């Protein structure tokens, strides 16, 4: 699906994904993630692979734009993300963006 974000088109909005379970190195944080993960994205905004020369740049945009857009939309519904929430969203959305890169790369 094509998309416009922040006034720029040429984005794609990926499919709704099975959001991975991320581990953080304590059981507490792992449980916090399980209890909160429904608040985090399950789909990612990205741009065509050919607009980058490397994987890290593709993934950086995907993480950055996805979380920006998610924060806008969810703020309008009364959400507020803690520092911990932001960190955890960065980690899961990074994984989902790397998975998407690998789909683009094998195509």
């Amino acid at each position: 699906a094509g998309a416009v974000v922040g006034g720029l088109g040429g984005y794609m909005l990926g499919s709704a994904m099975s959001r991975p379970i991320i581990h953080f190195g304590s059981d507490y944080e792992d449980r916090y993630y399980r209890e909160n993960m429904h608040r985090y994205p399950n789909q990612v905004y990205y741009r065509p692979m050919d607009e980058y020369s490397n994987q890290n740049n593709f993934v950086h945009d995907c993480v950055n734009i996805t979380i920006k857009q998610h924060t806008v939309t969810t703020t309008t519904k009364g959400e507020n993300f803690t520092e911990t929430d932001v960190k955890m969203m960065e980690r899961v959305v990074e994984q989902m963006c790397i998975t998407q890169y690998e789909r683009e790369s094998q195509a």
Partner: nanobody
Framework: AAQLQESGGGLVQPGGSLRLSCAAS????????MGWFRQAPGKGREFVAS????????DYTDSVKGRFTISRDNAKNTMYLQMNNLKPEDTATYYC?????????????????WGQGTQVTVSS
């Protein structure tokens, strides 16, 4: 028709330093995010660094982070790229460009108004 023009390129020894400039015509410089890209023969144009309209945030590609510094002088319609600890792999034509949309990104499609470029060659 805002026009961008790069300058400051040259031939630099490895480990050397160069400062590039990007001069903008017109009267809306400070209203737009801006970025630097580079292109070497055989490769496509790739992200180097970016800076928001107000200068409040900047961004870099991994391979130049810590060596290169982007800045802008909003009173003088000019952006700069300070390139330190230059390496052979930094050889390229460097382009400045104006951001599209409200967010600085790394993608080629995030910018337009490309200048004609300035050549940087780092010897080896």
């Amino acid at each position: 028709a805002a026009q961008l023009q790069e300058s400051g390129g040259g031939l630099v020894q490895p480990g050397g330093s160069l400062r590039l400039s990007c001069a903008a015509s017109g009267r809306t410089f400070s209203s737009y995010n801006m970025g630097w890209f580079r292109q070497a023969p055989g490769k496509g144009r790739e992200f180097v660094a970016s800076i928001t309209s107000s200068g409040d945030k900047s961004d870099y590609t991994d391979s130049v982070k810590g060596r290169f510094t982007i800045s802008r002088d909003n009173a003088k319609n000019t952006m700069y790229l300070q390139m330190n600890n230059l390496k052979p792999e930094d050889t390229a034509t460097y382009y400045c460009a104006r951001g599209l949309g409200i967010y600085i990104i790394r993608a080629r499609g995030g910018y337009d108004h490309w200048g004609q470029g300035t050549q940087v060659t780092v010897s080896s």
